Amino acid sequence: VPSWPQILGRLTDNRDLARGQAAWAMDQIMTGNARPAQIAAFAVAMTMKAPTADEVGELAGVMLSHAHPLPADTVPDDAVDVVGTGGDGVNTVNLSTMAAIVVAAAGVPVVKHGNRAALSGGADTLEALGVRIDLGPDLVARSLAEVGIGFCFAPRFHPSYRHAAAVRREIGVPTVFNLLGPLTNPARPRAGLIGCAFADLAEVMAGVFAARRSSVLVVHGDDGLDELTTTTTSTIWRVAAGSVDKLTFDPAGFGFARAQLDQLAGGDAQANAAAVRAVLGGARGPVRDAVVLNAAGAIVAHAGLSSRAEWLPAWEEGLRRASAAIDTGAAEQLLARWVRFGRQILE
Amino acid sequence: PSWPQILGRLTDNRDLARGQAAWAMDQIMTGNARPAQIAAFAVAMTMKAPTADEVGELAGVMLSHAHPLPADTVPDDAVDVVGTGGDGVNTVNLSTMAAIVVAAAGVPVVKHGNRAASSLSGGADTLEALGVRIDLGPDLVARSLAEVGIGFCFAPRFHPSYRHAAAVRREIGVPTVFNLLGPLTNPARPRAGLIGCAFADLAEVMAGVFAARRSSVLVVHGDDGLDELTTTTTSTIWRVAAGSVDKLTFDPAGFGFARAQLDQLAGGDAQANAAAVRAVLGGARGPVRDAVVLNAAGAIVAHAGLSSRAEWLPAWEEGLRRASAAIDTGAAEQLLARWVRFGRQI
Ligand SMILES: O=P(O)(O)OC[C@H]1O[C@H](OP(=O)(O)OP(=O)(O)O)[C@H](O)[C@@H]1O
Ligand SMILES: O=P(O)(O)OC[C@H]1O[C@H](OP(=O)(O)OP(=O)(O)O)[C@H](O)[C@@H]1O
Ligand SMILES: Nc1c(F)cccc1C(=O)O
Ligand SMILES: Nc1c(F)cccc1C(=O)O
Ligand SMILES: [Mg+2]
Ligand SMILES: [Mg+2]
Ligand SMILES: [Mg+2]
Ligand SMILES: [Mg+2]
Numbered sequence: 001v002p003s004w005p006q007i008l009g010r011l012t013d014n015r016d017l018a019r020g021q022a023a024w025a026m027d028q029i030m031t032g033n034a035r036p037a038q039i040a041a042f043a044v045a046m047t048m049k050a051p052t053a054d055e056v057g058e059l060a061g062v063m064l065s066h067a068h069p070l071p072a073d074t075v076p077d078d079a080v081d082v083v084g085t086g087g088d089g090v091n092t093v094n095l096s097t098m099a100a101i102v103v104a105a106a107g108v109p110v111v112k113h114g115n116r117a118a119l120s121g122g123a124d125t126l127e128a129l130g131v132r133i134d135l136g137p138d139l140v141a142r143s144l145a146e147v148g149i150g151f152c153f154a155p156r157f158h159p160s161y162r163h164a165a166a167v168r169r170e171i172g173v174p175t176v177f178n179l180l181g182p183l184t185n186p187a188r189p190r191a192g193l194i195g196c197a198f199a200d201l202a203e204v205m206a207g208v209f210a211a212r213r214s215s216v217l218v219v220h221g222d223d224g225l226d227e228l229t230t231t232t233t234s235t236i237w238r239v240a241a242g243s244v245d246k247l248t249f250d251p252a253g254f255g256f257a258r259a260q261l262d263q264l265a266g267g268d269a270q271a272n273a274a275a276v277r278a279v280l281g282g283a284r285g286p287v288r289d290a291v292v293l294n295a296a297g298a299i300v301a302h303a304g305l306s307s308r309a310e311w312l313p314a315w316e317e318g319l320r321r322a323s324a325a326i327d328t329g330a331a332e333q334l335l336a337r338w339v340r341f342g343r344q345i346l347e
Numbered sequence: 348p349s350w351p352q353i354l355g356r357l358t359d360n361r362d363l364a365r366g367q368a369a370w371a372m373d374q375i376m377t378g379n380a381r382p383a384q385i386a387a388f389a390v391a392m393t394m395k396a397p398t399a400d401e402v403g404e405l406a407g408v409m410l411s412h413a414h415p416l417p418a419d420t421v422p423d424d425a426v427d428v429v430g431t432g433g434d435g436v437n438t439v440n441l442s443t444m445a446a447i448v449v450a451a452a453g454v455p456v457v458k459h460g461n462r463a464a465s466s467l468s469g470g471a472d473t474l475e476a477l478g479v480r481i482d483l484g485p486d487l488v489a490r491s492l493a494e495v496g497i498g499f500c501f502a503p504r505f506h507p508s509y510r511h512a513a514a515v516r517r518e519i520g521v522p523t524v525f526n527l528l529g530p531l532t533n534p535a536r537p538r539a540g541l542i543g544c545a546f547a548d549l550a551e552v553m554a555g556v557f558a559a560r561r562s563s564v565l566v567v568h569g570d571d572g573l574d575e576l577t578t579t580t581t582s583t584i585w586r587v588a589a590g591s592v593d594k595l596t597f598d599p600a601g602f603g604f605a606r607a608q609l610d611q612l613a614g615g616d617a618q619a620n621a622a623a624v625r626a627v628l629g630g631a632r633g634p635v636r637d638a639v640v641l642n643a644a645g646a647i648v649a650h651a652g653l654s655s656r657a658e659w660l661p662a663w664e665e666g667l668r669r670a671s672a673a674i675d676t677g678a679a680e681q682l683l684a685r686w687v688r689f690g691r692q693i
Contacts, residue, residue, distance in 0.1 A: 037518040038519060041386040041387070041519045043387075044390045045521075048390075048394040049394075173354040175358075
């Protein structure tokens with residue numbers, strides 16, 4: 001007998017939902033049948049109760065069922081995502097976006113799910129670099145084939161999420177909905193480096209990826225970043241073979257100096273675009289270090305699709321590959337090809 | 348102050364800073380809060396567990412927007428008999444019947460009330476079915492009180508600015524902190540009350556709110572879940588007076604009441620619950636009468652806590668004698684007839 005009073009009452013009683021209940025709520029939300037008050041009540045109550053992997057998997061699966069897919073056979077079986085929840089409140093340079101370009105230039109297909117900022121988000125910085133972010137399925141697929149990277153603009157691919165997105169903006173507070181972006185990449189890559197700004201939810205995210213048998217590293221810098229940080233240690237939930245394994249990660253062990261958080265600070269889209277250019281041009285410093293680290297992490301997750309290689313050697317090769325992709329010019333070249341691809345669409 | 352700040356604080360499981368609940372409630376009451384913001388606030392405050400101070404801000408803000416009764420029309424010793432509802436049992440209208448009995452005993456009653464939310468017939472629905480006019484404005488409620496000894500303030504008529512919150516309450520269905528506010532926002536502001544709370548955890552908070560007012564109240568929760576003094580088992584009573592609270596366990600067997608079953612108090616539609624009122628006021632004996640008498644006496648005890656040095660036990664004994672006598676002498680039946688007549692001569 002599924003209804004808002006039943007489901008909200010259950011959450012306010014601090015109980016886990018029965019199977020199917022989160023799915024019912026999400027189909028109400030995605031069909032436009034949930035009133036803004038019902039959407040908001042649900043988002044908040046799920047959050048304060050503490051969502052489970054099963055519940056979030058129901059939310060994400062329903063949401064994915066409403067998303068526009070890419071055309072059949074256009075996403076390589078070994079594509080990776082590099083993306084985070086955002087909401088770390090630190091306003092850094094676009095680490096996930098830089099790492100994605102490096103990863104793709106290392107020869108790993110990247111299909112990025114992303115969006116604007118909620119100063120300058122991945123999407124905004126890409127636009128300032130000349131990249132066309134609002135392409136439909138056919139052209140993302142083409143971009144992926146021809147350039148080795150594509151970008152799925154969330155509003156383009158998840159039109160039915162617009163009711164939920166407006167509630168999110170109205171209430172402001174982070175909720176369980178902040179987890180859905182990384183879990184609803186419409187290209188469904190099976191590997192990724194996934195940042196989570198909320199330490200208490202990284203494990204849940206990992207659990208959802210583990211139920212899908214994805215090869216993923218869910219990461220949270222112990223300084224609060226939804227990225228692998230160089231300012232201190234990070235916690236990594238390693239997902240492979242459908243099991244989650246919690247780990248502490250210290251970059252110092254690979255020879256990385258401790259950086260300060262303000263060394264990674266970003267600005268507007270133009271500032272962040274120049275930061276991307278600096279790093280791809282091979283400039284040394286904390287930003288490159290951070291990009292290389294996150295790129296290596298994605299490469300490590302990609303490796304887990306076809307092996308269970310030892311952790312430390314996987315990382316060493318990951319960092320080497322990331323570093324080479326920059327220093328051979330491959331990463332700077334890939335960004336140029338990507339811009340060129342978007343400019344060809346007109347004719 | 349902002350919604351992101353206040354909501355973040357609540358989702359972090361922190362009590363709000365002084366003034367923040369008031370800011371939120373005033374946004375809600377002025378129509379400046381989006382329905383999503385109203386719902387988030389209501390749910391987050393509920394799951395955090397509201398404090399007495401926070402609820403006092405909510406109710407106090409809500410009262411600042413209400414229509415008052417005209418000056419000098421509510422006696423100093425008027426009493427309310429009302430609860431949160433939401434007890435899920437769909438009993439007969441015990442508070443409403445108790446209110447009639449209390450007025451018939453000679454205690455001024457200004458009842459706050461509203462239609463049913465989850466039950467089949469709320470107090471207002473039942474009063475309407477009895478022929479009492481529930482839709483009177485401040486002036487005529489004050490007249491009812493002077494001329495009949497009882498008045499009824501219908502929440503939608505006295506709290507028009509609460510309409511945005513009320514609608515969100517309906518849309519989400521789940522009980523929230525807002526369900527506490529009815530009993531705390533009687534627009535006539537009576538200083539005494541028998542106030543039922545269906546939520547064991549929140550009764551204490553409601554008592555706290557009354558403690559900070561100039562009030563003599565019994566906040567009551569039946570240990571079977573009723574938002575009334577129950578006859579099926581003990582009740583917890585938060586006795587409020589002089590700015591403090593005395594929590595105690597109350598057992599009506601001490602006054603010779605037989606233990607009843609919950610099903611014996613079950614109500615039906617407005618016509619059914621109206622028939623139950625007429626039966627009780629006509630002298631019919633049984634579990635329902637017993638519960639009405641018990642709650643009427645509770646109200647009379649709260650009233651005595653205003654200007655009477657009577658101690659707890661003697662007060663109860665007197666309250667029970669008065670409540671029973673109001674029924675048996677026909678006074679309560681007569682008062683209801685008078686209340687209906689009053690309404691028809693307008
Ligand atoms: O505005 P916020 O809520 O803080 O989120 C900042 C960014 O983090 C996420 O992107 P992603 O990880 O793809 O991009 P980035 O790390 O390259 O910025 C999100 O889609 C935003 O672009
Ligand atoms: O439908 P529910 O949410 O359970 O509410 C039942 C009733 O409880 C409250 O009234 P009150 O204590 O005045 O009425 P009573 O005579 O029914 O006790 C409320 O105003 C409802 O009328
Ligand atoms: N942010 C959005 C999204 F992620 C999906 C669909 C719509 C929106 C939106 O802001 O309208
Ligand atoms: N229940 C209401 C109330 F208590 C105040 C204002 C409006 C309503 C309503 O039911 O719409
Ligand atoms: Mg990121
Ligand atoms: Mg980030
Ligand atoms: Mg009642
Ligand atoms: Mg009741």
